[PDB]
Write a protein that binds this ligand. Structure first.
Ligand SMILES: OC[C@H]1O[C@@H](O[C@H]2[C@H](O)[C@@H](O)[C@H](O[C@H]3[C@H](O)[C@@H](O)[C@H](O[C@H]4[C@H](O)[C@@H](O)[C@H](O)O[C@@H]4CO)O[C@@H]3CO[C@H]3OC[C@@H](O)[C@H](O)[C@H]3O)O[C@@H]2CO[C@H]2OC[C@@H](O)[C@H](O)[C@H]2O)[C@H](O)[C@@H](O)[C@@H]1O
Length: 222
């Protein structure tokens, strides 16, 4: 028999080389729809995958964060020399309100609660916007070959910094650690914090008959 192979459950996952591919439909209760995900290929620190979705309702509420998460031991920033990454992706769908973003977390201890979250958005689609206490940038730095718009704002007892590419970026390669150095140098983030999480995926708000194709994604820590 041939069956649907994509996984669709709220907390379903797949293991793929150095990655976990999470469905992470954490916000599904905020609306109506569904989301199914699958691995296409993998080899060590590289993965190709896709996700398709339709979400309605809860227009300002994220429904999910399907993502490829690197398996690694939490490491203090001052022990990291570079985090090379490459990401090639494309989106299809209608009325897509979503981002394509890295999601990363810093904590005082390896097993402890997060203190900072750092997102790096390669795309803001359909008017999607980052968490921001003002609605405006705090800085507009050039990092890893891209001109970014940096925002900040709270999420519970954490501060979220979001670097948003000036233009939609379907193909990206550079050193993700440059974003952590930037915040250590410019925003008072301690270089003694542990990087606990390195994820790359998409946050949908609303849209229909959407599909993200990640043709290539790689990341490592040196
Ligand atoms: O009992 C059911 C199963 O629970 C699983 O645990 C889940 C928790 O119940 C969820 O609370 C948790 O949701 C978080 C999710 O993993 C993150 O991806 C998401 O990150 C947000 C971030 O908060 C936001 O600041 C940033 O802008 O955007 C990212 C991406 O969307 O955050 C979720 C929680 O925060 C939101 O909800 C609470 C609000 O107060 C807050 O404002 C919201 O933002 O997810 C876990 C599962 O997470 C794990 O798997 C998915 C991975 O992607 C993730 O990294 C892993 O930690 C249990 O694990 C299961 O065993 C249970 O069956």
């Amino acid at each position: 028999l041939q069956r649907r192979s994509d996984f669709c459950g709220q907390w379903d996952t797949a293991t793929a080389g150095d990655f976990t591919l999470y469905n992470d439909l954490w916000g599904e209760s905020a609306g109506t729809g569904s989301q199914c995900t699958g691995v296409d290929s993998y080899s060590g620190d590289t993965i190709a995958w896709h996700t398709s979705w339709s979400w309605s309702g809860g227009s300002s509420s994220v429904k999910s964060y399907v993502n490829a998460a690197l398996t690694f031991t939490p490491t203090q920033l001052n022990c990291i020399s570079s985090i090379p990454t490459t990401w090639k992706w494309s989106y299809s769908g209608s009325s897509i309100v979503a981002d394509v973003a890295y999601d990363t977390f810093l904590a005082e201890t390896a097993s402890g609660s997060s203190k900072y979250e750092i997102m790096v958005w390669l795309a803001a689609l359909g008017g999607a916007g980052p968490i921001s206490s003002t609605g405006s940038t705090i800085a507009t730095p050039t990092i890893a070959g891209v001109n970014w718009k940096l925002y900040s704002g709270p999420n519970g007892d954490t501060t979220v910094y979001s670097f948003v590419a000036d233009s939609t970026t379907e193909s990206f390669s550079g050193d993700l650690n440059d974003f952590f150095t930037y915040l250590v140098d410019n925003e008072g983030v301690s270089d003694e914090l542990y990087l606990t999480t390195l994820e790359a995926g998409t946050e949908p708000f609303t849209g229909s008959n959407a599909k993200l194709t990640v043709s290539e994604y790689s990341i490592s820590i040196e």
